[PDB]
Design a protein around this ligand. Structure first.
Ligand SMILES: Nc1nc2c(ncn2[C@@H]2O[C@H](COP(=O)(O)OP(=O)(O)OP(=O)(O)O)[C@@H](O)[C@H]2O)c(=O)[nH]1
Ligand SMILES: [Mn+2]
Ligand SMILES: [Mn+2]
Ligand SMILES: [Mn+2]
Length: 321
């Protein structure tokens, strides 16, 4: 019910204050605080994002919510507690982790992502699916980014919410990320209402490129204008910012922004040049990709940029389309 959903949100918003105190003030939180500071988190950014620490006792959240008068079973359904199935007893889901609030599209805290700071697995532990937290719907930072997305008529999608935090602080505000999932049909429906222009800047590795191709292809087929920023090999946005600084980052993101078709063919360049079967198949694929582009201006530019990869004229490529 809506009443239950609101109670679950309250639980999240109240415990956030306790996690924040635990991180910034308590002895147990000192190592986690140092870890964040070494990753460039200022006191101000930690406060701004409401970042906290979940102690390792296994009953910190449980006892707090109990004292405040919340139903324990509801706290379990809200994803803040786990249940011992042999015992039927409850305990903290999040233990010894740095706690990043996950806000919904209206800016209410509806879940947490808890990162290890001691090399434990999983690296990140999220809230489970709950009535208020759904990974196929939530986009990290969307409530904060919405204004600039509309103003700039573009959304930028990163892999990691940490990348979003760093990018935002660096000056790139129109950024969001999923919570470790493939961009959903629901996400795309949400995004389309804000803008038709989406730029993908995933990590600079094989998995990142593969995800760029898959996600970009689907966005294109869904009728969006797709762009790609290619980070240096082995780097994600947080890592680029750390190495080159804010100004270099916001300049970089403004420089080599390629239409999806141009990015795709550049990835496939060597296979096309050596494998005649792939040559034929990718010429047809790229022809189809270009045909899907809603922008007449960018469609014509893509034709000019893609044609040389096949050693054909822009006129010949246009004919194929
Ligand atoms: N559920 C879950 N999601 C994860 C896990 N590890 C990574 N992810 C998700 O995948 C995204 C990208 O993975 P990474 O490239 O390792 O993210 P990252 O921002 O570089 O992580 P760090 O900089 O090391 O803090 C993360 O932001 C998470 O949303 C995990 O262990 N469990
Ligand atoms: Mn990766
Ligand atoms: Mn990364
Ligand atoms: Mn990273």
């Amino acid at each position: 019910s809506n009443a239950d959903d609101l109670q679950m949100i309250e639980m999240h918003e109240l415990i956030q204050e306790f996690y924040y105190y635990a991180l910034t003030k308590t002895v147990e939180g000192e190592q986690a605080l140092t870890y964040l500071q070494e990753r460039g988190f200022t006191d101000a950014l930690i406060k701004e994002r409401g970042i906290g620490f979940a102690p390792d006792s296994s009953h910190f959240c449980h006892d707090f919510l109990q004292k405040k008068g919340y139903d324990i079973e509801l706290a379990y359904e809200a994803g803040l507690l786990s249940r011992n199935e042999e015992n039927f007893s409850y305990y903290d889901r999040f233990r010894n982790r740095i706690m990043f609030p996950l806000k919904n599209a209206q800016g209410r805290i509806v879940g947490y992502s808890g990162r290890t700071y001691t090399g434990q697995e999983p690296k990140y532990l999220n809230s489970p699916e709950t009535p208020i937290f759904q990974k196929r719907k939530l986009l990290y930072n969307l409530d904060k980014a919405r204004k600039s997305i509309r103003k700039l008529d573009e959304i930028v999608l990163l892999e990691g919410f940490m990348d979003v935090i760093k990018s935002d602080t660096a000056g790139l505000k129109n950024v969001v990320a999923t919570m470790g999932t493939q961009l959903s049909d629901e996400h795309i429906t949400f995004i389309r209402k804000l803008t038709s222009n989406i730029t993908l800047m995933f990590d600079g590795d094989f998995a990142g490129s593969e995800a760029t191709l898959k996600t970009g292809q689907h966005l294109l087929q869904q009728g969006l204008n797709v762009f790609v920023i290619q980070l240096p090999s082995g780097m994600d946005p947080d890592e680029y910012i750390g190495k080159y600084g804010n100004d270099a980052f916001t300049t970089f993101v403004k420089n080599d922004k390629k239409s999806f078709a141009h990015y795709k063919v550049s990835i496939l360049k060597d296979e096309i040049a050596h494998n005649d079967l792939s040559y034929e198949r990718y010429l047809k694929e790229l022809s189809h990709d270009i045909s899907l582009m809603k922008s007449s201006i960018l469609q014509q530019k893509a034709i000019n940029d893609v044609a040389p990869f096949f050693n054909v004229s822009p006129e010949q490529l246009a004919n194929e389309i």
